[PDB]
Amino acid sequence: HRFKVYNYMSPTFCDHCGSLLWGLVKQGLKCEDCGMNVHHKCREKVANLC
């Protein structure tokens, strides 16, 4: 995965843990290749294979 911080425009959940990507900006990281969305705290918890 190529995770880069993303500022989300509508409520998006973390594809790893299920909770909302909280906040007004920079709520989480979206993988540039597959679109997976994770919380900053959940990025270390995701498997590496994209």
Ligand X SMILES: CC(=O)O[C@@]12[C@H](O)[C@@H](C)[C@@]3(O)[C@@H](C=C(CO)C[C@]4(O)C(=O)C(C)=C[C@@H]34)[C@@H]1C2(C)C
Of 20-49, which residues contact a second copy (CB under 8 A)? 25
How many residues form the binding site for a second copy (CB under 8 A)? 4
Pairing of strands 3-6, 28-31: antiparallel
> What does the alpha-carbon distance between residue 49 and residue 44 come to, in Å, rounded to a whole number?
13
Q: List the single partner that 35 binds among a second copy, Zn ion, ligand X, none, CB under 5 to 8 Å by kind.
A: none
Neighbours of 3 (CB within 10 A): 18
Beta bridge partners of residue 20, listed in sequence order: 13
CB of 5 to a second copy, least distance (A): 9
Residues forming contacts to Zn ion in the complex (CB under 5 A) are 1, 14, 16-17, 31, 33-34, 36, 39, 42, 50
